[PDB]
Amino acid sequence: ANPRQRNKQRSGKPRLTRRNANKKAKAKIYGNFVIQQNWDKHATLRQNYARLGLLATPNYVTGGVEKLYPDPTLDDVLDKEISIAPAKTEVVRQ
Amino acid sequence: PTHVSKTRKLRGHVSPLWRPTVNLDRLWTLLPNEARDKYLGKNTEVAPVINVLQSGYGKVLGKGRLPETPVIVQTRYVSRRAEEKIKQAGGVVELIA
Amino acid sequence: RPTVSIYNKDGSVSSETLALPFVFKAPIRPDLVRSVHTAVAKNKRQPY
């Protein structure tokens, strides 16, 4: 439409086409090797974090989570020590 | 739609302080149903607590009769007749700052 | 409830059955479905 755009529409030189428009592709994992091995590329990060035994956010989630199946006072607290947390997943144990 | 418009047929014819209010009759409705089955109609030593502030209400008004079961009403403000009916029903009012 | 027989890969009836879900007893409304479909089949319309 533009004089610049019509300039290369009538020009014989081919366009500088780069085929980078692949949507639906989720970024692959670098960083941790243990995460990369146990990470599957189809699932979302919230699904991968939950499966691996990790937290995607330490806060509340600002939406309704998915449901795939029908599931079935200072002193005593300021100085208390939380007895760590158990490792439920082999990856978390790893 | 343009098709159902009547101009398709004219073709050819030349053309303050935030304080929501709750009344006494709805005080028991605010409480869930399983607690009402447990506390309403039974003379239990422990009484249910209805914090009407957490349910988005600022003042408790006096419309309605409460059942004779006592209940502790925690609120910010309460009409004078409302807490009259509350102790007549056996309950108490704890004003919340 | 009524039961529906399950069919194997070769079309033979399997001995297992499932009770008919309540959704199959829901009211069948041509008028309501047509109106919902009219509005829902409009939600992937690009502008012009």
């Binding site: 949507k23 970024a27 960083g31 979302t44 995607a56 330490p58 806060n59 | 957490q54 | 502008p47």
Partner: protein
């Protein structure tokens, strides 16, 4: 001047990709920091509890974290907020203390010369 929202689905997917790109960079760790719990500043909202910006310097000190390593392990600091009541202090100390118990800290590599 009319603003249109035809790119509303395009924006939603772009952010989900951006979250995915974050997790690619930093995989074993959450894509969000831990925010404190605070009470909104009005008579209309003070009954509720929402997420603040960061944990005050007293909340970090009471929990056992220093204000220098707090950012390293992902704990935001708010130098502006202060603890006017023990209720707010004890609430956010346990928010950190739960965080520290649930946290795995991978060791770094420390350079050490031949002599001391």
């Amino acid at each position: 001047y009319v603003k249109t929202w035809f790119n509303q689905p395009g924006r939603k997917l772009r952010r989900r990709q951006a979250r995915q790109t974050k997790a690619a960079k930093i995989a074993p760790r959450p894509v969000e920091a831990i925010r404190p719990a605070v009470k909104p500043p009005t008579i209309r909202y003070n009954m509720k509890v929402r997420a603040g910006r960061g944990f005050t310097l007293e909340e970090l000190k009471a929990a056992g974290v220093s204000r220098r390593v707090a950012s390293t392990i992902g704990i935001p600091v708010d130098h502006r907020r202060r603890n006017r009541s023990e209720e707010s202090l004890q609430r956010n100390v346990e928010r950190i203390k739960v965080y520290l118990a649930h946290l795995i800290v991978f060791p770094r590599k420390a350079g050490q010369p031949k002599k001391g």
